[PDB]
Design a binder for this molecule. Structure first.
Ligand SMILES: Cc1cc(/C=C/C#N)cc(C)c1Nc1ccnc(Nc2ccc(C#N)cc2)n1
Ligand SMILES: Cc1c(CO)cnn1-c1ccc(F)cc1
Ligand SMILES: Cc1c(CO)cnn1-c1ccc(F)cc1
Ligand SMILES: [Mg+2]
Lengths: 412, 556
């Protein structure tokens, strides 16, 4: 009751974004979901005088028989005012990434209890398309705080604090962080005990008058990184040395004191790629000095909250993917590698979509925001398939890389 | 009086900051004025317009148009100015159904809703913006002022508001009668079904009763319109569909405009007639675009045209969609970046056909083009049928497996089977993952003077083989490729090549089988003849042996 006034940014109109094609099964799922939402008063049919649109689709969560509606609010979110209103801002908890277990709950259903400002509702318009456009698309707008809209956790925040008050007081060591529709709850407790506290938290919400039963278990304290490492060999071919010199040359952009001079002089003359070259003393020392340099962290690396996070991903083959998260080039805030399976042994695009989601999760936990992705895929391939594999309730930004990176070699 | 339900009005606004139109009424002949007065008098009696007071500041110009042969005038109110100032609406008439997605129907009846077409109420607050003036005879009295009570023809919001109003009326009828389909186009309603013809006729009467609730009358004497329907450039029949007749003109001379209309016809035909090709005819439109300019047809264009004429020799039809059957999509490579496809359920009966053309780029290959074609057909099929067809592709399973596992990008194609229908898509070369033992190692380099465009390209090898070629009209990037070409040309069937060129690596790692660059093409031709090629990259100027040597030789 008593909606918070919401506006777009100055000079901006509402989103007009084309609905992309949906499969029969997704349309059917959305028709059933929206019919109920309309009955519960969450959404209402709208007329032709509302020009706006935001795309909608549906996803099936890990271990669930039921579809979840997912609205892609990315455009609306860009066009919506930032919220300083009661709150100056939420300083992102730095201890969340230090917990031994972090469970992710979908709390988005709680948002539906708060009415959305009457004048802002039209900007939430969405369309359920029909197969072959044989009947007019079904047009709705939200009467309450929608899931996936950045304004929702902002507006619901006063209620959430109230709800979580007895749990926080009873449990001072628990780190609870909210991002969009997700609630991230960390603890250092034994997992069986951790799981109990999670269900304890669930009931708090449930009794408040309610996909909540689910949880997504993370262990960020065990999250690793990929420092630059060099081969240790008893015999080096000309090819091995060329690869080493190439890798070190690349590293010298990241690290100040890397020297290739002595190693490069092992290559003196014009030799068969497979010929074994013994290392000279000067070369061996130089290699050792480079090894030591590479065991130190990179100089002048700092996170700036005013700048976008950028995430790059390389396909390494055999279900392996490497990635780097950075603000400025060569200053990596995080690097990593996924040998992760989750099916998709015959599908590259499913693997990539899973990687994008896992990286975004890591980014949310560490910095409290999503990165902009540079994806090693053709746009048309990505756009055709990504929504088939998408399990997250948010969506990040992305762009496409059409030129093969030479640096794939050295993250391998 | 039988009470009727009012049609709810849609609230309408002008764009923010904008006022309504104020536009001078043109002078009109006394003849035209009298005709407009009579026309408006009738319209006013029917409640469509109303006379207004002097206080309304707005105006839109009114015209009198004479129907050809006629003694009878028609009223035209030109809403162009009001339309500029009217808010945007949701427009549902985009996204026309494709005939191939329609279902076979036993009966399709047409009802005339034109009574409703001009009868939908206009939002009361917006009516003032529709004001117009009939000029007085001789200009000796104030003009007669009217405004619209109903959606005006030619106004920006009329099609969307009429469609949405009709849809809302029809919704409960459609929902409670799942055994029929209803489609609204202009002033007609089309109702199909599979019902026994008596039952179908009953549903039609029931629909007529339902419409009466809003006071909308459908004429007792029924429609002249019957299957086949000419609609949106197609011909719809109860059990089949096609495109309206495609006839390619005979000419001894062709212009920009004629070749444009030719390709447009061919594009339209390609959704049913299999194998249509536009490549060579499209190439004639490159650059230029002086419309009346006559372009000589190349031999290639003539060949393509002749091939199309044969395809278009006799009528071809598609069938409709049967939801109980799988969709199959089959693709063939036509050459020159052209691909063609058929989508069917039963063998030898196509729902639709289509084509795909290679995207413009410096370098490409057949596998990438096939992949792109697949994604295009997939997207089209989701739109039309709401599902992905099973694919039949002219590429072997082993070929695809080798491609996607080794390709630097993520790539995928959905469920598919190999069909052996030449030409087959294949991998023309694959580079080695590891240096080749026993194969000669070529260290290559090139350099060019940025001013004179003079350069050198060459190599040195572990066997002491060496070459340096002086070059003219070249660039550093070109010499780097030239050097690689020389190494391929001069080596045996297995070779290791070492380059410092990131540019050359970027191109080769993209695995092109064809290029706009003649140099890249000859490089590809060389690669195809090798048994084994290992390409290694090293950084320039690092003191790397054999790279240093050749860099010095080529730097002049
Ligand atoms: C899009 C559409 C255009 C017209 C007509 C437009 C006009 N003019 C008529 C109808 C009834 C429809 N709607 C649908 C929906 C589902 N299946 C069909 N199948 C179908 C339609 C016409 C014929 C015929 N003859 C056969 C099958 N039509
Ligand atoms: C264009 C698009 C997006 C936009 O990123 C997401 N899915 N799609 C899509 C969906 C279905 C298709 F068949 C093709 C593409
Ligand atoms: C073969 C070719 C082309 C066309 O394929 C362009 N430059 N070159 C070229 C010419 C001379 C060379 F030594 C190496 C390459
Ligand atoms: Mg050089």
């Amino acid at each position: 009751i008593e909606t918070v006034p919401v506006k777009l940014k100055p000079g901006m109109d509402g989103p007009k974004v084309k609905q992309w094609p949906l499969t029969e099964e997704k349309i059917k799922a959305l028709v059933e979901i929206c019919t109920e939402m309309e009955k519960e008063g969450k959404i209402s049919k709208i007329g032709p005088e509302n020009p706006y649109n935001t795309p909608v689709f549906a996803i099936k969560k890990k271990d669930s028989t039921k579809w979840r509606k997912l609205v892609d609010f990315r455009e609306l979110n860009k066009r919506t005012q930032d919220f300083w209103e009661v709150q100056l801002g939420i300083p992102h908890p730095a201890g969340l990434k230090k917990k031994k277990s972090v469970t992710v709950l979908d709390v988005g259903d709680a948002y539906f209890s708060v009415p959305l400002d009457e004048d802002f509702r039209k900007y939430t318009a969405f369309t359920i398309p029909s197969i072959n456009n044989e009947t007019p698309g079904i047009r709705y707008q939200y009467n309450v705080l929608p899931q996936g809209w950045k304004g929702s956790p902002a507006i619901f925040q006063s209620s959430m604090t109230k709800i979580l008050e007895p749990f926080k007081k009873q449990n001072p060591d628990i780190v609870i962080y909210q991002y969009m529709d997700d609630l991230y709850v960390g603890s250092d407790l034994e997992i069986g005990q951790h799981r109990t506290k999670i269900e304890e938290l669930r009931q708090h919400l449930l009794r408040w008058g309610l996909f909540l039963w689910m949880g997504y278990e993370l262990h960020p304290d065990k999250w690793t990184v990929q420092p630059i490492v060099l081969p240790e060999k008893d015999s080096w071919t000309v090819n091995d040395i060329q690869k080493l010199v190439g890798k070190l040359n690349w590293a010298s952009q990241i690290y100040p004191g890397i020297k290739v001079r002595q190693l490069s002089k092992l290559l003196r003359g014009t030799k068969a790629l497979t010929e074994v070259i013994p290392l000279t003393e000067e070369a061996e020392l130089e290699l050792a000095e480079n090894r030591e340099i590479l065991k130190e962290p990179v100089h002048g690396v700092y996170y700036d909250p005013s700048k976008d996070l950028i995430a790059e991903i390389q396909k390494q083959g055999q279900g392996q993917w490497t990635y780097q998260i950075y603000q400025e080039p060569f200053k990596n805030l995080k690097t990593g590698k996924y040998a992760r399976m989750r099916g998709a042994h015959t599908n590259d695009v499913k693997q990539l979509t899973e990687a994008v989601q896992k990286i975004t999760t890591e980014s949310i936990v560490i910095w409290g925001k999503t990165p902009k992705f540079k994806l090693p895929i053709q746009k048309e391939t990505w756009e055709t398939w990504w929504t088939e594999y998408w399990q997250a309730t948010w969506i990040p930004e992305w762009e496409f890389v059409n030129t093969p990176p030479l640096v794939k070699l050295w993250y391998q | 009086m039988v009470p009727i339900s009012p049609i709810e009005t849609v609230p309408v606004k002008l764009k923010p900051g904008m006022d309504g139109p104020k536009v001078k009424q043109w002078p009109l002949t006394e003849e035209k004025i009298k005709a407009l007065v009579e026309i408006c008098t009738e319209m006013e009696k029917e409640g469509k317009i109303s006379k207004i007071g002097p206080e309304n500041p707005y105006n839109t110009p009114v015209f009198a148009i004479k129907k050809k042969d006629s003694t009878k005038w028609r009223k035209l109110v030109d809403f162009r100015e009001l339309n500029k100032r009217t808010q945007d609406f949701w427009e549902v008439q985009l996204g026309i159904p494709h005939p191939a997605g329609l279902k076979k129907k036993k009966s399709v009846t047409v009802l005339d809703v034109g009574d409703a077409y001009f009868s939908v109420p206009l939002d009361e607050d917006f009516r003032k913006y529709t004001a117009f003036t009939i000029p007085s005879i001789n200009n000796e009295t104030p003009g007669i002022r009217y405004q619209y009570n109903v959606l005006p023809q030619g106004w920006k919001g009329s099609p969307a508001i009429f469609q949405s109003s009709m849809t809302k009326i029809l919704e409960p009828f459609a929902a409670q009668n799942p055994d029929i389909v209803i489609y609204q186009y202009m002033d007609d309603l089309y109702v199909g079904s599979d019902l026994e013809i008596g039952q179908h006729r009953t549903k039609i009467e029931e629909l007529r009763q339902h419409l009466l609730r809003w006071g909308l009358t459908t004429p007792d004497k029924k429609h002249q319109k019957e299957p086949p329907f000419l609609w949106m450039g197609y011909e719809l029949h109860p059990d089949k569909w096609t495109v309206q007749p495609i006839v390619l003109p005979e000419k001894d001379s062709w212009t920009v405009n004629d070749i444009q209309k030719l390709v447009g016809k061919l594009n339209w035909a390609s959704q049913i007639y299999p194998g249509i090709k536009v490549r060579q005819l499209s190439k004639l439109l490159r650059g230029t675009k002086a419309l009346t300019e006559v372009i000589p047809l190349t031999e290639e264009a003539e060949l393509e045209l002749a091939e199309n004429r044969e395809i278009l020799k006799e009528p071809v039809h598609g069938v409709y969609y049967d939801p109980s059957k799988d969709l199959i999509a089959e693709i063939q490579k036509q050459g020159q970046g052209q691909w063609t496809y058929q989508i069917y359920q039963e063998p030898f009966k196509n729902l639709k056909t289509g084509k795909y053309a290679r995207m413009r780029g410096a370098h490409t290959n057949d596998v990438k083009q096939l992949t792109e074609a697949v994604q295009k057909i997939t997207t089209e099929s989701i739109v039309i049928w709401g599902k992905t067809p099973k694919f039949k592709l002219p590429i072997q399973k082993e070929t695809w497996e080798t491609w996607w596992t080794e390709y630097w990008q993520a790539t995928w194609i959905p469920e598919w089977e190999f069909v052996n229908t030449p030409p087959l898509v294949k991998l023309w070369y694959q580079l080695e993952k590891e240096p080749i033992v026993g194969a000669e190692t070529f260290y290559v380099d090139g350099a060019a003077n940025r001013e004179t465009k003079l350069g050198k390209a060459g190599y040195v090898t572990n066997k002491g083989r060496q070459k340096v070629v002086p070059l003219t009209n070249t660039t550093n990037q070109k010499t780097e490729l030239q050097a690689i070409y020389l190494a391929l040309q001069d080596s045996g069937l297995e070779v290791n090549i070492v380059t410092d060129s990131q540019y050359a690596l970027g191109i080769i790692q993209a695995q092109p089988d064809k290029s706009e660059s003649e140099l890249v093409n000859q490089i590809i031709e060389q690669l195809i003849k090798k048994e084994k090629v290992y390409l290694a990259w090293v950084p320039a100027h690092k003191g790397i042996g054999g790279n240093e040597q050749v860099d010095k030789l080529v730097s002049a």
